[PDB]
Amino acid sequence: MKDHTIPLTLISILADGEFHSGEQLGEQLGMSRAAINKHIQTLRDWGVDVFTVPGKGYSLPEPIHLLDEKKISQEIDHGRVTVLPVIDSTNQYLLDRLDELTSGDACVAEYQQASPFGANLYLSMYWRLEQGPAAAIGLSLVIGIVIAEVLQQLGAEQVRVKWPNDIYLQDRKLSGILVELTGKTGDAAQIVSGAGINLVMGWISLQEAGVVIDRNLLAARLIKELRLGLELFEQEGLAPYLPRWEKLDNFIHRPVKLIIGDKEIYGISRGIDAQGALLLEQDGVIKAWVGGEISLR
Amino acid sequence: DHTIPLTLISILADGEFHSGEQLGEQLGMSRAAINKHIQTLRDWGVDVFTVPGKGYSLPEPIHLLDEKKISQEIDHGRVTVLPVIDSTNQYLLDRLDELTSGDACVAEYQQASPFGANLYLSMYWRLEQGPAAAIGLSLVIGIVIAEVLQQLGAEQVRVKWPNDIYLQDRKLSGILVELTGKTGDAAQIVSGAGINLVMQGWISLQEAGVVIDRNLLAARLIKELRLGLELFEQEGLAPYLPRWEKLDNFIHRPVKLIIGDKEIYGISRGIDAQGALLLEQDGVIKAWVGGEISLR
């Protein structure tokens, strides 16, 4: 099998359609000017109409777009996946790499050093919202519905969600969601959302519920479905998820216990409003709360 | 870096026993250096079961996260891009043993038409049912590619029965479907196409005033072709009959059919449920399952 990287890297540089003298290319590719002529010859051999002028050098009449594996794969998958079975934190790996991350990029692991090996599935995904930080209102919810639905689609049909960042099964924590957001006025919002699912044995595990899933299968699908769910949330907001949310709310129409800071509130949850805030009914008045943690009572 | 402890778990995935020397042989280290690594395995919570005489083992093997295993389920097949190649179809055909349905190969210059002038794409597919389940496969490829071109601005793209995409009564792309079959066993097909992107008889997308980035065009094809084949895999030609008529370039037109050394004349009337050409001659409509058609 012949190797064609060297002539391909030549034409890729020339894709400007501009002129490049012999030395200029000989610098980048690190070869002699005859080697440049040899490969630019093979370009003419391939049918590439490269015209050579003495002083200026070689050029292509019209700039060309070339086949790129990375360009192609980005459009098929909407993001890459880096799997490190042992890691410190799936969320941290992405946070340390925001500069070259694109929406849909994911990181998968089964042991977080920062709970035994393979007992949990750890998944994080980056997403960039063109709209400012305000466009990520119910993201943490959105991750919850998508992950929970995926577990339902895989046999764990009785998994529910706890407002705002937890997956519950048998009124017990099956998975925790942790979304981390950095924002700046004008600039876009960069969010790395992550979760950890209890696979094997307060807390509950997938196997305890009689649901068996191959970890690669659970991982792949979540990344697939979460990517799709986030594109929906990017162009439509929380609106499509309001009907989907209530169907999985574990504490809706039940007494809940809210702890915001050093304060404690009592009442019946009534789901969420269009802004993802908890609806707490107290003596018939249902008014929304935006932060804290809920608890059955 | 954690490769050595992780590569250790893969070795133990037999469920068998491995002595200190055996692990020190494979990884090329001392068994004391190895012993440090079974510690880190036990440190992570890995239940490494050690019996004195026999050695180290995992009672039940563990399944580890693998990019290749994971990515198969998101994409349903891989993509190898070789901008210069002999034949995208041949690349897949030379690898049927290690191909899975949806695997694709992309190129823009086939050495076995100048560089970058054409997009060359091939995809492998295995149908559990024998060759009989591949009735209209070439049609299905034609429908999917033509629809994608419409979805990307080339809204006047049509199909010529059974293996060509046509635009302004000229060949814009050729389809080449290759099938090997055996009774009982599945059918292995490498279906491929080449689309004229830039510059009578032949036409290019640029000649038709349609601009489409080749990387974008390629990617959309693999998705829709993968999706189209699963549909064809579990439902057959039936859903594509309406889609075919919507794209047939020669329906209700006078055509000339050349199968082998014979020449037939008549009016095309589309296809039947089996993807065969319906040729009307003097009001007599007789079906043909092979050959090539041309205008007249």
Yes or no, beta carbons of A82 and B74 under 8 Å apart: no
H or E element: which one contains B39?
helix B31-43
CA A174 to chain B, closest CA, distance in angstroms equals 20
Tokens 């800071």, residue located: A261
As given in the structure block, the two tokens for residue B186 are 């599945």
Contact B203, B196 (CB under 8 A): yes
As given in the structure block, the two tokens for residue A77 are 């998958």
Contact A5, A69 (CB under 8 A): no
CA B210 to chain A, closest CA, distance in angstroms equals 15
As given in the structure block, the two tokens for residue A249 are 């709310």
H or E element: which one contains B73?
helix B67-75
Beta bridge partners of A272: A278
Domains belonging to chain A, first-starting first, are 4-59 (1.10.10.10), 71-247 (3.30.930.10)
Yes or no, beta carbons of B116 and A219 under 8 Å apart: no
* Start-to-end CA span in chain A (Å): 69
β-strand B164-167 against B170-180: which pairing, if any?
antiparallel
Q: Return the closest-CA partner of residue B64 out of A214, A107, A122.
A: A214
Please give the residue of chain B at the shortest CA–CA distance from A81. Answer: B67
Count Cβ atoms below 10 Å from residue B26 Cβ, excluding itself: 13
β-strand B187-196 against B104-107: which pairing, if any?
unpaired
Yes or no, beta carbons of B63 and A216 under 8 Å apart: yes
CA A71 to chain B, closest CA, distance in angstroms equals 6
Contact A69, A14 (CB under 8 A): no
Beta bridge partners of A20: A58
The whole-angstrom separation of Cα B106 and Cα B82 is 6
CA A216 to chain B, closest CA, distance in angstroms equals 5
Yes or no, beta carbons of B67 and A83 under 8 Å apart: yes
Yes or no, beta carbons of B115 and A48 under 8 Å apart: yes
Q: Return the closest-CA partner of residue A294 out of A275, A273, A279.
A: A279
Q: DSSP letter for A110, please.
A: S
Instruction: List phi, psi (to 5°) of A243.
Output: -65, -40
Yes or no, beta carbons of A66 and B114 under 8 Å apart: no
Tokens 């410190």, residue located: A88
Residue A176 vs residues A136, A256, B287: alpha-carbon distances, Å: 18, 18, 62
Query: Please, which experimental method was used?
Result: X-ray
CA A15 to chain B, closest CA, distance in angstroms equals 11
The whole-angstrom separation of Cα B51 and Cα B46 is 16
Count Cβ atoms below 10 Å from residue A174 Cβ, excluding itself: 27
DSSP notation for A241-296? HHHHHHHHBSSTTSEEEEEETTEEEEEEEEEE-TTS-EEEEETTEEEEE-SSB--B
Binding residues of B: 87-89, 110, 171
Q: DSSP letter for A65, please.
A: P
Q: Please tell me which of the candidates A76, A117, A221 has its beta carbon nearest to residue B73.
A: A221
* Residues of chain B contacting residue A65, judged by C-beta atoms under 8 Å apart: 213-215
Quick one: how many helices (H) and strands (E) in chain B?
Answer: 8, 16
Please give the residue of chain B at the shortest CA–CA distance from A219. Answer: B70
The whole-angstrom separation of Cα A47 and Cα B198 is 13
The whole-angstrom separation of Cα B178 and Cα B188 is 8
As given in the structure block, the two tokens for residue A143 are 């991750």
Yes or no, beta carbons of B116 and A69 under 8 Å apart: no
Count Cβ atoms below 10 Å from residue A203 Cβ, excluding itself: 13
Q: How many CB pairs under 8 A join A and B?
A: 126
The whole-angstrom separation of Cα A143 and Cα A179 is 9
CB-side exposure of A185: number of CA atoms within 13 Å?
Answer: 0
The whole-angstrom separation of Cα B161 and Cα B268 is 10
Q: What SS3 state is found at B24?
A: helix
Return contacts of B43-50, CB within 8 angstroms, 24+ apart: B44/A86, B44/A111, B44/A116, B44/A117, B44/B5, B45/A111, B45/A115, B45/A116, B45/A117, B45/A118, B45/A119, B46/A116, B46/A117, B46/A118, B46/B9, B48/B12
Which ranges constitute the DSSP H helices of chain A?
5-14, 22-29, 33-45, 69-77, 90-95, 139-153, 215-236, 241-248
Which of A111, A216, A222, A223 best probes binding to B when mutated, by most B CB atoms within 10 angstroms? A216
Tokens 């389809």, residue located: B175
Q: Please tell me which of the candidates B45, B74, B213 has its beta carbon nearest to residue A77.
A: B74
H or E element: which one contains B227?
helix B214-235
The whole-angstrom separation of Cα B119 and Cα B203 is 13
Q: Which chain B residues touch A if contact means CB-CB below 8 Å? A: 2, 5-6, 41, 44-46, 62-67, 69-75, 79, 81, 83-84, 106-109, 113-117, 119, 213-216, 218-220, 222-223
Contact A140, A179 (CB under 8 A): yes
Yes or no, beta carbons of A109 and B79 under 8 Å apart: no
As given in the structure block, the two tokens for residue A243 are 């009907």
Yes or no, beta carbons of A67 and B5 under 8 Å apart: no
The whole-angstrom separation of Cα B32 and Cα B14 is 22
Yes or no, beta carbons of A117 and B44 under 8 Å apart: yes
Please give the residue of chain B at the shortest CA–CA distance from A87. Answer: B2
Q: What SS3 state is found at B69?
A: helix
As given in the structure block, the two tokens for residue B268 are 């095309």
CA A110 to chain B, closest CA, distance in angstroms equals 7
CA B73 to chain A, closest CA, distance in angstroms equals 6
Tell whether the torsion through CA atoms of A27, A30, A35 and A39 is positive or negative: negative
Tokens 């997956």, residue located: A167
In angstroms, how far apart are the furthest CA atoms of chain B?
Answer: 89
This structure's resolution (angstroms)? 2.8
The whole-angstrom separation of Cα B160 and Cα B281 is 19
* Residues of chain B contacting residue A117, judged by C-beta atoms under 8 Å apart: 41, 44-46, 62
